Amino acid sequence: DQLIASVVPELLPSAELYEDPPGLEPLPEEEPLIAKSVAKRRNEFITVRYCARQALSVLGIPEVPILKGDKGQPLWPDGIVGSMTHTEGFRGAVVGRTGEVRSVGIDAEPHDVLPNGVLKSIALPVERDELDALPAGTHWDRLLFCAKETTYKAWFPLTARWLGFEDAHITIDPDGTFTSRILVDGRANDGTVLSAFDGRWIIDKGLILTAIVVPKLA
Numbered sequence: 164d165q166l167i168a169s170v171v172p173e174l175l176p177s178a179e180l181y182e183d184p185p186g187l188e189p190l191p192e193e194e195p196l197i198a199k200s201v202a203k204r205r206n207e208f209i210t211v212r213y214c215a216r217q218a219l220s221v222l223g224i225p226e227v228p229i230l231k232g233d234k235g236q237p238l239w240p241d242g243i244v245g246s247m248t249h250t251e252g253f254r255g256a257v258v259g260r261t262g263e264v265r266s267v268g269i270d271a272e273p274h275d276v277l278p279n280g281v282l283k284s285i286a287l288p289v290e291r292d293e294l295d296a297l298p299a300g301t302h303w304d305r306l307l308f309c310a311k312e313t314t315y316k317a318w319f320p321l322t323a324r325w326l327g328f329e330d331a332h333i334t335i336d337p338d339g340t341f342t343s344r345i346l347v348d349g350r351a352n353d354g355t356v357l358s359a360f361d362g363r364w365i366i367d368k369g370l371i372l373t374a375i376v377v378p379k380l381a
């Protein structure tokens with residue numbers, strides 16, 4: 164039934180909430196990050212971290228703050244990878260152990276057309292042609308955007324480098340998979356090279372959810 168669980172492997176626990184339940188609070192160490200933030204931002208930050216801590220507990224990790232690094236990335240415990248996402252109607256998180264996977268990214272977007280002008284900013288010309296050829300009945304522009312954001316979230320923990328929308332070609336399959344091909348140098352922090360990612364996607368509840376797992380080194 165759950166969206167994240169439908170697009171990631173069983174060994175990565177996940178949790179998701181569609182509303183902000185009453186009474187949640189950040190951990191004390193997290194409060195400074197949202198002390199001057201509007202209510203919508205506070206709620207998304209707090210609720211998503213409740214989900215992340217639930218998933219962490221399945222791995223046997225007890226309550227821990229989830230702070231943000233220099234580029235906004237979540238700072239997980241040593242030995243853990245994970246990803247979080249929040250949009251109106253969705254907060255979700257997934258975590259895993261570094262002994263089982265290398266990286267994970269997820270992203271939820273509303274299943275609506277992109278705002279005016281955004282497709283031109285995020286798509287390669289060839290991608291625009293590809294999207295126009297896909298079957299009618301899905302907002303392929305929004306799916307592409309979501310998949311590219313997930314690509315960055317899986318890439319950044321392994322490279323510590325920017326990846327722009329123009330720096331990867333994403334090909335969407337109607338069957339619920341996609342691929343991301345990196346067009347820039349793919350050197351990762353540990354000396355390996357990233358060149359392509361395999362992704363999965365689902366549309367339900369008026370939402371798109373995309374996910375990439377970078378698998379354990381073969």
Ligand SMILES: CC(C)(COP(=O)(O)OP(=O)(O)OC[C@H]1O[C@@H](n2cnc3c(N)ncnc32)[C@H](O)[C@@H]1OP(=O)(O)O)[C@@H](O)C(=O)NCCC(=O)NCCS
Nearest residue numbers: 234235236237248249311312314315316319326327328331
């Ligand atoms: C960072 C980004 C991908 C977030 O995606 P989004 O769809 O806007 O927002 P989401 O709600 O899905 O995800 C937000 C969460 O991403 C996570 N995040 C932020 N920066 C991150 C990073 N550098 N690496 C990994 N995860 C990151 C955080 O946990 C954040 O939630 P928090 O602030 O409550 O901790 C997006 O805002 C962005 O800046 N994109 C530019 C880079 C990009 O997408 N390149 C395309 C590559 S092909």
Ligand SMILES: [Mg+2]
Nearest residue numbers: 250270271272
């Ligand atoms: Mg999003």
